[PDB]
């Protein structure tokens, strides 16, 4: 009994440990969010399938690492879902063919927000999985420890909804003018969703965001967002109605807005935060 | 914040 990975590392007969580098594509599912499915990443085989049968379980102590350790989740091992980190060894999976077959493990994240997310830097430890192998022949009891590393920069969604982009940049025409903000949201299942804006503002209305450009900032101007022509103040929940699996647009358009005094030539920049909420 | 929008612009003359 031995194992291989897709990224080119293996653990021999007797067990050991190995580093697994995986491309992450986290998505929201209903009631739980997928972090990574390792069944296409890790494979094992039986060396004497005609005579011996290997028993493979997900040992206890299997946990998230790095930043994700602060979250509770579930793990799908061969069709049934168990709490993650595992506090108990899962039931056995039978292994009986020389051909390398998947280790059916998929790590999920329990939702905690509406559309929130957590940033994972590439090279980060994201999990430590322990595979315990035994048989019906002798008294063998081996450990295969898998250190899962993130191959890429990603945001793992922690909510029941997801955005088209976590960080957006749009460019206005030279003053005066406006431009649409392509930004949509979808949910794993139907949710009554809403969002509100965040940022530093210059007006009593709390709607005109300050120009925080570092070099040659144009004075007298700021940015103001609209939806259907209506100005959106900061910290005021914009209701979207029901949002399902189909992406729904936030309907935002960025416009210039005068702050006070003379408008002079120069750069304009405004960072605006968007937070989603259930209604 | 769940998402961040960066709006860039210029005033020319
Ligand atoms: C006297 C022949 C008995 C056979 C010896 C082969 C050793 O078995 C290997 O392969 C077995 C699975 O094919 C495992 O159960 C065992 O732990 C080890 O990985």
What does this structure look like?
The complex is a heterodimer of chains A (279) and B (13). Chain A has two domains: 1-157, Sandwich (Immunoglobulin-like); 158-279, Sandwich (Immunoglobulin-like), CATH 2.60.40.1090. Helices cover 0% and strands 50% of the residues of chain A. Chain A has no helices and 28 strands. Chain A has strands spanning 2-5, 10-11, 15-22, 27-28, 33-37, 42-45, 54-58, 63-64, 73-77, 80-84, 93-95, 101-102, 105-109, 117-120, 125-135, 142-150, 154-157, 161-163, 167-171, 178-180, 184-187, 191-198, 221-227, 230-231, 238-243, 248-249, 253-258, 266-278. In chain A, strands 3, 7, 8, 11, 15 and 16 form a six-stranded mixed beta sheet that branches. A five-stranded antiparallel beta sheet of chain A has the order 4-5-13-9-10, with no helix packed on it. Chain A has a four-stranded antiparallel beta sheet with strand order 2-1-6-12, with no helix packed on it. In chain A, a hairpin with a 2-residue loop joins strand 9 and strand 10. The radius of gyration of chain A is 25 Å and the shape is elongated. Chain A starts with a strand and ends with a strand. Chain B is rod-shaped, with a radius of gyration of 12 Å. Chain B contains no helices and one strand. Chain B is mostly beta strands. The interface between A and B is medium-sized, with 43 and 13 residues. Strand 19 of chain A pairs parallel with strand 1 of chain B, so a sheet runs across the interface. The complex binds heptyl alpha-D-mannopyranoside. Heptyl alpha-D-mannopyranoside binds next to loops of chain A. Heptyl alpha-D-mannopyranoside is lined by residues 1, 13, 46-48, 52, 54, 135, 137, 140 of chain A. The PDB classes it as cell adhesion. The entry lists the keywords protein secretion, Gram-positive, isomerase. It forms a dimeric assembly.
């Amino acid at each position: 009994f031995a194992c291989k990975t897709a990224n080119g590392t293996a653990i021999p007969i007797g067990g050991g440990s190995a580093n697994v580098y995986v491309n992450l594509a986290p998505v929201v599912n209903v009631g739980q969010n997928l972090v990574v499915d390792l069944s296409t990443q890790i494979f094992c085989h039986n060396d004497y399938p005609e005579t011996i049968t290997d028993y493979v379980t997900l040992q206890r102590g299997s946990a998230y690492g790095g930043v994700l350790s602060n979250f509770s989740g579930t793990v799908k091992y061969s069709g049934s879902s168990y709490p993650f980190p595992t506090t108990s060894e899962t039931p056995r999976v039978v292994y009986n063919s020389r051909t390398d077959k998947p280790w059916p493990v998929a790590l999920y994240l329990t939702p905690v927000s509406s559309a929130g997310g957590v940033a994972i830097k590439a090279g980060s430890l994201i999990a430590v999985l322990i595979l315990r192998q035994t048989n019906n022949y002798n008294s063998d009891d081996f450990q295969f420890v898998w250190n899962i590393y993130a191959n890429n920069d990603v945001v793992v969604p922690t909510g029941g909804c997801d955005v088209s982009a976590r960080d957006v940049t749009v460019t206005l025409p030279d003053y005066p003018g406006s431009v649409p903000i392509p930004l949509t949201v979808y949910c794993a299942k139907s949710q009554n969703l809403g969002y509100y804006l965040s940022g530093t503002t210059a007006d009593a209305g709390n709607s005109i965001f300050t120009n925080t450009a570092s070099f040659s900032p144009a004075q007298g101007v700021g940015v103001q967002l609209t939806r259907n022509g209506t100005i959106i103040p900061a910290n005021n929940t914009v209701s979207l109605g029901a949002v399902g699996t189909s992406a729904v647009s936030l309907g935002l358009t960025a416009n210039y807005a005068r702050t006070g005094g003379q408008v002079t030539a120069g750069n304009v920049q405004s960072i605006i935060g968007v937070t989603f909420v259930y209604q | 914040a769940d998402s961040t929008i960066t709006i860039r612009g210029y005033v020319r003359d």
